[PDB]
Each structure stands twice: as structure tokens, then as C-alpha cells.
């Protein structure tokens, strides 16, 4: 019951899924071999792990995941590393030749020969789950297989599974620092698929995570490992409501309608705190109000999208640990009193809160410190128009005189697809601006 299927696409999706599944195994007490530790081999088991791991008669759990990448390097790294026993040889579908940052190549030429197998794996995973809540897709729109193959997979999932919930925890290109040069093309081309064929989209850009790790976790040289550890902590904090008993448990559809006001408006900003090392954690008064304020601070979130430059639409808080409902209420009241952050006029309440009794867990050999209480905040706000403006100004300045367009048109993509994507992103800006405008 309450199962959710994790589909990981691209290198970024594969690595963040590796971190997520390591952390899930740590929370549910699952050894890297895929089985419970021998010393605590109780015959009867609870239903908590059922949401993420499928049980086998031998007593060895199997994650409800589908790793998928055209490039075989990362999937072979998973199949060779410490989680080879945990991971099925199937549901780890591999390609042979890469997309190479090309949305056209990953969606029109090389994606068709593997999308069918990917959907076969999805059906095999879904028939095992009797209470499937939905799908969580981890990928980065910057790359080719993340954008193209991810777009195709989300389209096929939407056309096959009907109105099943879909959460793309995707990594958009960060505003000032970027790794790929055709990354603006990939983002602007995949925003069409993430708009119509994805029910909720979460921004997980890299430089905000870097700044958070540098300024709060006190790491001078953070890496993708630390970034993915934070992303996995956020995923666990959001999904633990149905995994563990809490004062106010929420499911996927519980916050789906509370966070999506309009069908076209579902992009949401993410934030998590307290994220502090052991060297500093006990120096501050880690209370519910303090952690809520830290989350609402522009420097305490996972995205480079200032809320003070925008306007919040709907806030959802996921408290974990020794949190008290009226401590949450006091935090909400002080947020109402605070004037730096302001909500839209037509949404008076604008708050969702879910209290869970499970505090976050820290990976062995990690750098974060376990805390009495934590909270993850996911918010729909009008400020995402600014990151959209950054990316679309990037795209127009790149597209002024036909840069890199020959690569895309040589892979079965029409030239007008870029124009259609640009108009779609312009409309995605315009509707945000209109709904943020005062009544």
C-alpha cells in the first residue's frame, strides 16, 4: 500500500537516485546486500518499507526504482558498486550509445529503441504495487537523455497511466554557473514536457546547494555527492509522511491539490532546514520557529530564486521529529506577522503542514549532523518567473543566429520546435505574472 515508483533518468538522476536509495536503505535498516541485518532478523515485518521496497519470499527487499540512461557508465557503476546485490539486474535498464546533451537525439533517434523497454519495466514495477501513489522522476533537464528521454518517458507515462501523480524532482540549469553549453536548449525544449506531462515539478539547481553546503554545512569543497545527499534528504523528508506514523500524515494527493492552484502552475520552490554540521548544530536554538524562519530565509533554500522578489502562492511544510502542532501554528503565525515575505491576495490560508515523528537520519561517514527536528518546505510562488526569464533570455541570446541548431535538426527535429518551445515558455512566464498580479 501507498507505493511510489522512483524513475531515475540521466546521469544526474542516476546519481541522485543512488544517494536517495542509500539513504532510504539507511532509514529502513536495509543492508547494502538488500536484506535486513542478521542480528535483527525478526520473522514478521512492518508495512513501512512497502512504499519503497518490494518484499520477496526469501526476505530480501528490492527497491521500487527504474534506473535508465543511454550512457552505460553510470548504470554499470551502480551494477558494480556496493548496491549491486540490492539492485535488480532488471529495472536498471541500460542503453549503448549516449544522447550527448542533444534533446533531439535523446527524444527522436536514440530514445525510441529504449523507451519501449523502459515502459515494460515500469509496467512490471507497477503491477506489483497494489496502492501505487505515483511516480517520482529524478533527472536534470540540462543534459540530453535527461531532457529528451525524460520527456518521452513522461509523455508515455501520462498517456498510459492516466491521472497517476507525477513528481519531477528535476535539476534545472543554475542561473550563473552552467556545465553544458546547449543546456539552455535542453531546458527550454524539455519545459514543454515538464509543463503538460508532469503534474508537479521541483527545482533542484546546483549552485544553491553549493552555497548552502558552503555557508551552513561548512564544506569549502562540496561535490555532487553532497548535493545528492541533500536532495535525498529532501526526498525522504517529503515522502516520510506516508512511511512513518505522524501527528498529521499527508499523502501525494494530499499536497498535490494544496500546492497546485492551476493546471499550468505547478513548478514549486524547495527548501530544507536545519542543515547544519555537528560542529555548529547545538550552538543555535534549534526550535520549530527557528527552523521555519531559516527555511523561509532566501539563503536557506535549495534554489537561486529569491521569494522577496516574487510572491508566494501556496506553502507546504513537512516537519519531522519532536515537532508539535502548535509549535507549527506559532511558526505560521510569526510568518503571517513577518512582512518581508508576502503571499498573494486571493490565497488567504496558503499553508499546509504535516507533522511526522521520524527525525532525519545521517549517512555513516557523512558530514551532516542528526537533529531533534527538521522541516522541508515546498512552495508555489510567483518568483519562478525570474529563473524562467534568466533561462529564456539565455535561450534567445543563444538562438539569435542559429547556434548549435544543426546538431538538433540533424537528429530528426524540426527547426520550428525551438520556436514552439520558446512560445510555450513565454506563456509559462505570462500566466505566472498574470496570476501574481493583484486583483
Amino acid at each position: 500500500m501507498r507505493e511510489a515508483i522512483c524513475i531515475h533518468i540521466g546521469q544526474a538522476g542516476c546519481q541522485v537516485g543512488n544517494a536517495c536509495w542509500e539513504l532510504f536503505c539507511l532509514e529502513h535498516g536495509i543492508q547494502p546486500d538488500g536484506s535486513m541485518p542478521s542480528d535483527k532478523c525478526i520473522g514478521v515485518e512492518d508495512d513501512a518499507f512497502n512504499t519503497f521496497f518490494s518484499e520477496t519470499g526469501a526476505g530480501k527487499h528490492v527497491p521500487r526504482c527504474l534506473f535508465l540512461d543511454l550512457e552505460p557508465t553510470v548504470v554499470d557503476e551502480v551494477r558494480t558498486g556496493t548496491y549491486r546485490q540490492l539492485f535488480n539486474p532488471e529495472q536498471l535498464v541500460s542503453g549503448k550509445e549516449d544522447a550527448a546533451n542533444n534533446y533531439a537525439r535523446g527524444h527522436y533517434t536514440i530514445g525510441k529503441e529504449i523507451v519501449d523497454l523502459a515502459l515494460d519495466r515500469i509496467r512490471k514495477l507497477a503491477d506489483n504495487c497494489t496502492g501505487l501513489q505515483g511516480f517520482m522522476v529524478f533527472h536534470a533537464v540540462g543534459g540530453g537523455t535527461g531532457s529528451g528521454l525524460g520527456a518521452l518517458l513522461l509523455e508515455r507515462l501520462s498517456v498510459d497511466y492516466g491521472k497517476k501523480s507525477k513528481l519531477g524532482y528535476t535539476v534545472y540549469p543554475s542561473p550563473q554557473v552552467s556545465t553544458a553549453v546547449v543546456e539552455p536548449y535542453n531546458c527550454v525544449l524539455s519545459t514543454h514536457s515538464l509543463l503538460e506531462h508532469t503534474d508537479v515539478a521541483t527545482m533542484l539547481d546546483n549552485e544553491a546547494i553549493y552555497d548552502l553546503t558552503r555557508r551552513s554545512l561548512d564544506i569549502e569543497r562540496p561535490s555532487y555527492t553532497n548535493v545528492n545527499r541533500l536532495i535525498g534528504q529532501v526526498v525522504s523528508s517529503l515522502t516520510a509522511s506516508l512511511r512513518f506514523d505522524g501527528a498529521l500524515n499527508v499523502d501525494l494527493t494530499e499536497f498535490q491539490t494544496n500546492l497546485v492552484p492551476y493546471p499550468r502552475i505547478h513548478f514549486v520552490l524547495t527548501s530544507y532546514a536545519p542543515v547544519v554540521s555537528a560542529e555548529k548544530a547545538y550552538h543555535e536554538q534549534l526550535s520549530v520557529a527557528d527552523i521555519t524562519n531559516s527555511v523561509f530565509e532566501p539563503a536557506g533554500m535549495l534554489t537561486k530564486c529569491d521569494p522577496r522578489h516574487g510572491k508566494y502562492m501556496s506553502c507546504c511544510l513537512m516537519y519531522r521529529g519532536d515537532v508539535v502542532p502548535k509549535d507549527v501554528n506559532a511558526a505560521i503565525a510569526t510568518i503571517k506577522t513577518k512582512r518581508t515575505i508576502q503571499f498573494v491576495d486571493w490565497c488567504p490560508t496558503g499553508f499546509k503542514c504535516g507533522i511526522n515523528y521520524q527525525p532525519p537520519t545521517v549517512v555513516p561517514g557523512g558530514d551532516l549532523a542528526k537533529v531533534q527536528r527538521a522541516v522541508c518546505m515546498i512552495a508555489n510562488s510567483t518568483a519562478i518567473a525570474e529563473v524562467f526569464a534568466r533561462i529564456d533570455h539565455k535561450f534567445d541570446l543563444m538562438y539569435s543566429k542559429r547556434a548549435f541548431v544543426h546538431w538538433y535538426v540533424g537528429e530528426g527535429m524540426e527547426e520550428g520546435e525551438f520556436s514552439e518551445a520558446r512560445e510555450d515558455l513565454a506563456a509559462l512566464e505570462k500566466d505566472y505574472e498574470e496570476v501574481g498580479a493583484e486583483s
Binding site: E27, I42, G43, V44, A48, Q358
Partner: protein, 168 residues
Amino acid sequence: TLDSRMAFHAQQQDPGAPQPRQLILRYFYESGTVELMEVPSGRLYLKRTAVDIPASSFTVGSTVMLFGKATTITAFADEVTRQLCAQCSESTTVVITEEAFPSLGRYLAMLTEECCFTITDVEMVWVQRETISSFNLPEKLADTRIVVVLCTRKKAVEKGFAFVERTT
């Protein structure tokens, strides 16, 4: 939910029911919390709830009260639990003969407080000329009246040796 816990097979024997409930309970010894499930299905019988029952009385072969329910521990459930219970609550027996009956309460008080034992059970036994050989008690206790204490503590055998050396 990841906290270290002691898992024990337990029985309840609800009135009218022809069979015991056949539960398992985990006590999180760092706190006062207990939780229970049933062996066949696995549904949560009791949530994580704090109880006033001391941790020392949750040893094997002991019965306690959980919200008006007589719950009896039958055996351990995991070998980590067996190891930690052997380390912490080790059981032993002390038999006091008939010449120390006027100091029966004296000896019991020294068991409870001087020797730091916790008395899981205390009884009296009339020794028989057959039971003496059947259960290998000292021959001087034959056809007499003795008191037997099942008591648990760390290093229970050594503590019992210290007791019998310090008393008559």
C-alpha cells in the same frame, strides 16, 4: 523507528478466546516506549506508547500489565536482543534454608538493595527426599522448608556467590 529495541515473543490470552494472542513486543530501552504486533499478519497491535513498567521487569519469563492486558514474555526474538539481555539482565537462583527464616525479610532486602538484584520471583518450597536428587540441591536441605528467589542482575552468579559468602 531506528532506535535500539528489545524484541520479545509474548502472549495475552484475552478472555473467551481459545488461544493466546501470540504477539511480539519491542521495548525501546533508552526510553519507556513499547510497541506490539502479532506474528501471523504483522499489523500494528499497539503504537509506540510510554509505559511506567520498569525496564528490569521486561526479562524473559515475566508477565506485566499493558493497559489492563496481562502480557507474558515467553522467549526472545532476535540474537542481538539475546546478547544484550544476557549482558544486562542475567538470571540466577538463591535458596535460603530454614535456619534463616527469622531473617527472611533481611535477606530479601539485601537481595533487593545490597546486592542490586531485582527479584523476578520469590517462593517457598518444601523439599522432598526425591526432589532433592531430582533437582540437585544440597543434601542438608532434605525434608525441610526453603525459600527460592529467581533474581536478575549483571554478573548474577558472582553476585550470588558474594551474597552466600556474606550471609549464612
